[PDB]
Structure 1
Amino acid sequence: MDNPNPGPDGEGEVELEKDSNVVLTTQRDPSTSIPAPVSVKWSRWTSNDVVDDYATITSRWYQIAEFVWSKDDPFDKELARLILPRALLSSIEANSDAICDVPNTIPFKVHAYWRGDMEVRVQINSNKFQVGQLQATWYYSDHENLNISSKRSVYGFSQMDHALISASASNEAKLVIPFKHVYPFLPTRIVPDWTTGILDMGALNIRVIAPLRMSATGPTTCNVVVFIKLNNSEFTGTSSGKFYASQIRA
């Protein structure tokens, strides 16, 4: 079946992802990447306090990153290497804004410990005349590894669970990332231990496998949007906001 019928509305389907007071669309189905099974709820294990999450409020879609994709970028050059708990907060905090100001962060302010699966969209608007390729990959503990520069390479992450994005026919990388840390919970700020590496479950990272191969005088620049949903969460550990921690640098 192939009859093209673009009316006053150029025809084509648009799948949407609402899902909680925010609707974000994608005109092209994503290339998913599921690195692990869905995480069970270990609140009834580690902590016996206010055991809950926040539905309509922390299970939304906030923006955490956005960047540029150009012909200048050589073969393996990561556009982002963003930590995943974590840079949800660390993006907003360095936006000359506070964590307290946004609805998808506020319990991190009050509550001490967090556990939950993650959802991520790597949406880009590239043109059909751009011949490039990216790869969004996940690593459940990047900073803990010593020589991960060895792994920090397009070759290395192809070896593992990832998603693929090609400039033409742009395209989205779905990226379901459930919770798998060593300890079942994460600490939102400084704690009797975890005096650093606060709220870090691993980093995402997008490098390049094919530069934007542009014709003579073709459009140079491109762009990426990183979105994140925090579903299936649990926030036990009620603590005043003066105990909080404005996350570390990029």
Structure 2
Amino acid sequence: DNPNPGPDGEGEVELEKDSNVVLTTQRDPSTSIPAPVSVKWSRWTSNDVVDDYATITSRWYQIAEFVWSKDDPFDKELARLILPRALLSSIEANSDAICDVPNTIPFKVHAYWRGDMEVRVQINSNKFQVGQLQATWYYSDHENLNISSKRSVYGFSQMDHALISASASNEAKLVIPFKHVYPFLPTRIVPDWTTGILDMGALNIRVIAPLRMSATGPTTCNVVVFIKLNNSEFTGTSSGKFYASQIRA
């Protein structure tokens, strides 16, 4: 209630320090948790050496950056990421192999995976900009054919979601646990599973309030998405030459 800015700026930085990667937020995160915390399931269907690599897999790594402008209508999708595929496809979109990033080197060598997720969607918007976005997670997007009529902010507001206001420039934390029909997702081509490899559903960022401003205001803003794999477990140690690149999309 009594402001006194100095050379530092009178703020309070919140830190997310996860395995030598530190994320900083000026604002408070707007969290939303779709499902409760999952259990480890190496008991029921694995006899191979099952081990996470928490020093290299529970790190933060950007998977998407995009430009939200004022030339977007009311109900318009900005991002639609199939996150376990989107990590590998964001690496392959930077034109290299998957063995050059320490986050994804167990995906090259193992066969199956189960772990929870942490998604940070950070906007960099001016204080005078006005707008609002959704951060809605949907489990198993491709297994529903009527999802093309579902992708709208009217339907995504009904399930739980994270709101991002362009004025406050706040942040969206997304605790995504593993919830799938099968208790493991294969990383490569595996028997009677040829398509939809390592797909758990779509994080899709759409617009509620389009970006509004004055006549000479800053036209665009930037949105960056980071991901974390914290409660992982990798089973089925295999050859890396069996692995193939992801579908481009």
User: Displacement of 1:94 after TM fit?
Assistant: 1.6
**CA-to-partner distance for each residue in 1:43-74, whole Å, 9 max, x for gaps?**
11111111111111000001100000111011
CA separation in 1, counterparts of 2:3 and 2:59? 36
User: Displacement of 1:160 after TM fit?
Assistant: 0.4
Matched, 1:103 2:140: no
User: Displacement of 1:86 after TM fit?
Assistant: 1.6
Matched, 1:7 2:1: no
CA separation in 1, counterparts of 2:177 and 2:45? 18
CA separation in 2, counterparts of 1:25 and 1:163? 19
User: Displacement of 1:203 after TM fit?
Assistant: 1.0
CA separation in 1, counterparts of 2:96 and 2:134? 30
User: Displacement of 1:29 after TM fit?
Assistant: 1.0
**CA-to-partner distance for each residue in 1:68-114, whole Å, 9 max, x for gaps?**
01110111111100001121111111210211100000000000000
User: Displacement of 1:193 after TM fit?
Assistant: 1.8
**Runs of 5+ in structure 2 lacking a partner?**
none
User: Displacement of 1:19 after TM fit?
Assistant: 1.4
Q: Is the 8 A contact 1:133 1:165 kept in 2?
A: yes
User: Displacement of 1:41 after TM fit?
Assistant: 0.4
Match for residue 60 of structure 2?
A: 61
**SS of residue matched to 2:221:** coil
**CA-to-partner distance for each residue in 1:211-238, whole Å, 9 max, x for gaps?**
1111111000101000000000000110
**CA-to-partner distance for each residue in 1:124-180, whole Å, 9 max, x for gaps?**
110110010000100111110011011100111001010000111101000000000
**SS of residue matched to 1:68:** strand
CA separation in 2, counterparts of 1:9 and 1:60? 28
Moved over 2 A (4+): none
CA separation in 1, counterparts of 2:127 and 2:246? 39
CA separation in 2, counterparts of 1:194 and 1:6? 59
Match for residue 199 of structure 2?
A: 200
CA separation in 2, counterparts of 1:42 and 1:239? 19
CA separation in 2, counterparts of 1:3 and 1:158? 37
Match for residue 74 of structure 1?
A: 73
CA separation in 2, counterparts of 1:193 and 1:230? 26
- How many residues are aligned here? 249
**CA-to-partner distance for each residue in 1:173-205, whole Å, 9 max, x for gaps?**
000000000000000010002111000111100
**SS of residue matched to 1:235:** strand
User: Displacement of 1:11 after TM fit?
Assistant: 0.6
Q: Is the 8 A contact 1:74 1:211 kept in 2?
A: yes
CA separation in 2, counterparts of 1:64 and 1:52? 24
Structure with the bigger percentage of strand: 2
Query: Percent identity at matched positions?
Result: 100
CA separation in 2, counterparts of 1:17 and 1:71? 31
**CA-to-partner distance for each residue in 1:10-50, whole Å, 9 max, x for gaps?**
11101010011100111101110100011100111111111
Q: Is the 8 A contact 1:188 1:245 kept in 2?
A: no
User: Displacement of 1:249 after TM fit?
Assistant: 1.3
Q: TM-score, normalised by structure 1?
A: 0.98
- Aligned CA-pair RMSD: 0.7
CA separation in 1, counterparts of 2:37 and 2:82? 20
